[PDB]
Amino acid sequence: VGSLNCIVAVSQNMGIGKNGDLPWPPLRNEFRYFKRMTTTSSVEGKQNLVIMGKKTWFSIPEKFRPLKGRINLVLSRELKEPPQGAHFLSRSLDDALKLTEQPELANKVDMVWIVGGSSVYKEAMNHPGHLKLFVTRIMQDFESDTFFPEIDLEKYKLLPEYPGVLSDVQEEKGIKYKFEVYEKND
Ligand SMILES: NC(=O)C1=CN([C@@H]2O[C@H](COP(=O)(O)OP(=O)(O)OC[C@H]3O[C@@H](n4cnc5c(N)ncnc54)[C@H](OP(=O)(O)O)[C@@H]3O)[C@@H](O)[C@H]2O)C=CC1
Ligand SMILES: CCc1sc2nc(N)[nH]c(=O)c2c1Sc1ccc(C(=O)N[C@@H](CCC(=O)O)C(=O)O)cc1
């Protein structure tokens, strides 16, 4: 299995959600960025795995579930089986990551992408080892009811360049945003 990664889009007040959806109106090229980063694998014959909480699963419009070309794993302790359209169910982040080492997945999975929500971001960010965060900074405040956990910059270095990630300011629907990549190893 390849690298472990989080990906998120976050407002200036660290909002990631409101009422089961995003705080901001749809940013189509920001969604396309999410799709390109989470789907693209450099390793032939492999796919990437997405790990998400249950509310995050049900926040994706049904027509886009499962996230296509990716293996979709949902975290829940109440569900008894994967939701309709999902591929896997785990009861903890540690279980999910261990599952990637089972024979069922060991040679199928390239990258692992944690796509939220707040509790799994927080646990992953504090998971010892090598991790990258792909953070879209939405450069306005948006009313939110779900927030990104604190990024500890003593351990997460903001990278000064990354192949394939645009460095300049983006703007859609009058909303400016920029892409960042962080990396820790501890
Ligand atoms: N801007 C962005 O990049 C993102 C935005 N969002 C937004 O955030 C909101 C959803 O996030 P959030 O509210 O944090 O919810 P989550 O997606 O984290 O879902 C929470 C539920 O998932 C299960 N769960 C979460 N973590 C674990 C775990 N480690 N092990 C087992 N079960 C787990 C639980 O289900 P159970 O009770 O069944 O055990 C829990 O009640 C939505 O508004 C969505 O649109 C989400 C991701 C990214
Ligand atoms: C899954 C939770 C995440 S992680 C993330 N990261 C960044 N940078 N931006 C985001 O908005 C999200 C979100 S919220 C989100 C992301 C993607 C989608 C979605 O439907 N994605 C489709 C593409 C949707 C489209 O093409 O309009 C896909 O990846 O196949 C829905 C909600």
From Swiss-Prot:
Name of protein: Dihydrofolate reductase
Alphabetical UniProt keywords: Cytoplasm, Disease variant, Methotrexate resistance, Mitochondrion, NADP, One-carbon metabolism, Oxidoreductase, RNA-binding
Subcellular location: Mitochondrion; Cytoplasm
InterPro entries, A to Z: DHFR, DHFR-like_dom_sf, DHFR_CS, DHFR_dom
Residue ranges annotated for the DHFR domain, each copy included: 3-184
Class of the enzyme per the UniProt entry, highest EC level: oxidoreductase
Recorded family membership: Belongs to the dihydrofolate reductase family.
Reactions catalysed according to its record: (6S)-5,6,7,8-tetrahydrofolate + NADP(+) = 7,8-dihydrofolate + NADPH + H(+)
The EC number(s) this enzyme carries: 1.5.1.3
Disorder cited: Megaloblastic anemia due to dihydrofolate reductase deficiency: An inborn error of metabolism, characterized by megaloblastic anemia and/or pancytopenia, severe cerebral folate deficiency, and cerebral tetrahydrobiopterin deficiency. Clinical features include variable neurologic symptoms, ranging from severe developmental delay and generalized seizures in infancy, to childhood absence epilepsy with learning difficulties, to lack of symptoms.
Record carries keyword Mitochondrion: yes
Pathway recorded for this protein: Cofactor biosynthesis; tetrahydrofolate biosynthesis; 5,6,7,8-tetrahydrofolate from 7,8-dihydrofolate: step 1/1
GO molecular function: dihydrofolate reductase activity; folic acid binding; mRNA binding; mRNA regulatory element binding translation repressor activity; NADP binding; NADPH binding; sequence-specific mRNA binding
Example of a GO biological process term: tetrahydrobiopterin biosynthetic process
